[PDB]
Amino acid sequence: GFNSEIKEKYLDTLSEGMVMQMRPIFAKAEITETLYNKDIYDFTSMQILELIRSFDQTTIGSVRRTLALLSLYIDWAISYKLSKGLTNLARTISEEELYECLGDKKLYITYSELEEMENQLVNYQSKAVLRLLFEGVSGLAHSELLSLTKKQVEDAMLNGNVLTLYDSKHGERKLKVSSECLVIALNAAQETKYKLKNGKAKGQTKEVFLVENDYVVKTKRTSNKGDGQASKFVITNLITDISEFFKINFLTPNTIVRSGHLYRAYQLYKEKGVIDNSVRYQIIDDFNLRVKSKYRAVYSMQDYINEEEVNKYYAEELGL
């Protein structure tokens, strides 16, 4: 592409599979290279992030793989003193910064993405809102999530992981969830402090107090609301703080819930080869969704529960 001779020299050293991986990267990089009028090996770290973002990739995994290949090319270029500077600025990049490169095609998250994010989050309030929304504990006005108590979590733990949720408008509803979900919620329901900027605060105050109660989602004491149930704005703010840590713009209660549905669809698509209305029926049943007419909802789901989307996000898991 840009710097044809050098590129092809490096491609000669590769193993064809690697060459098939690199040809598209160099192709899509040509234009950023010609704009900056330099090769990738002289790019700065932020310029490398801008490049990878310009690839518009939908998973943190594909982003990690892309960065790795670029780092290999850069090591190569350093060894031959082609690079102006002699350090691999692609190696100085941190785990959160990669989420900047996730492009804007992305709307939904994969289960592996969820676990990685959770791992990077110091507060159990954050982990909990993410996980519980993923597994379907959202209600109308998030009533099922905001009324959730430690006792409900414990009972579920002693009940084959079946939560009895309370939506204020529609009433009671049962939901089987994972043990990870329940342990995370158990910790969240006992958390007394919340670390600002995901534990990377610069100023004098690093944490703030939460209210004293038995609810999983807890208001902050300063907010002047009661020591009882939290409002929907607490969930909005928790997700905002997460999005700011990872510098991403697609997270919404809706998209998280639907990511859960999509992951279930991926599993069933592996098991049974194709997604159809039986798969969608099964999803309605597993997440025990409130529907007036089953069939109306089955076809209403086709917009996001389909093969195009499952493949789009779960390709590598599919081995495609």
Numbering used by the authors: 1 to 320
Copy the relevant paper text.
Bacillus subtilis contains the SPβ prophage whose lysogenic state depends on the MrpR (YopR) protein, a key component of the lysis-lysogeny decision system. Structural characterization revealed that MrpR is a DNA-binding protein resembling the overall fold of tyrosine recombinases. MrpR has lost its recombinase function and the G136E exchange impairs its higher-order structure and DNA binding activity. MrpR functions as a master repressor of SPβ that binds to this conserved element to maintain lysogeny.
Crystals formed within one week of incubation, and we determined the structure of MrpR at a resolution of 2.9 Å by molecular replacement using the N-terminal domain (residues 1–105) of the MrpR Alphafold model and manually building the C-terminal part (residues 106–320). Two MrpR molecules were present in the crystallographic asymmetric unit. The monomers interact only weakly via residues of mainly two α-helices (helix H’ and I). As MrpR elutes as a monomer in analytical SEC experiments, the formation of a potential MrpR dimer appears to be an artifact of crystal packing. As other proteins with a tyrosine recombinase fold, MrpR harbors a CB (core-binding) domain (Gly1-Lys84, helix A–D) at the N-terminus, a catalytic (CAT) domain at the C-terminus (Tyr108-Ala320, helix F–M), which are connected by a central unfolded linker (Gly85-Leu107, helix/loop E). While amino acid sequence alignments of MrpR to tyrosine recombinases do not yield a high percentage of sequence identity (below 25 percent), structural comparison using PDBefold identifies the highest similarity to the structurally and functionally characterized tyrosine recombinases Cre from E. coli phage P1 (63,64), XerH from Helicobacter pylori, and the integrase (Int) from E. coli phage Lambda. Most of these tyrosine recombinases have been crystallized in complex with DNA to elucidate the recombination mechanisms in detail, while MrpR was crystallized in its apo form. While the CB domain in the MrpR crystal structure (in absence of DNA) is rotated by approximately 180° vertically and 45° horizontally compared to Cre, XerH and Lambda Int, the CAT domain needs to be flipped by 90° horizontally. We hypothesize that the observed organization of MrpR might be a crystallographic artifact since MrpR was not co-crystallized with DNA. The flexibility for the proposed rearrangements is provided by the approximately 22 residue-long linker present between the CB and CAT domain (labeled as helix E’ located between α-helices E and F), which is also present in Cre, XerH and Lambda Int. This structural rearrangement would also generate a positively charged groove between the CB and CAT domains of MrpR suitable for DNA interaction.
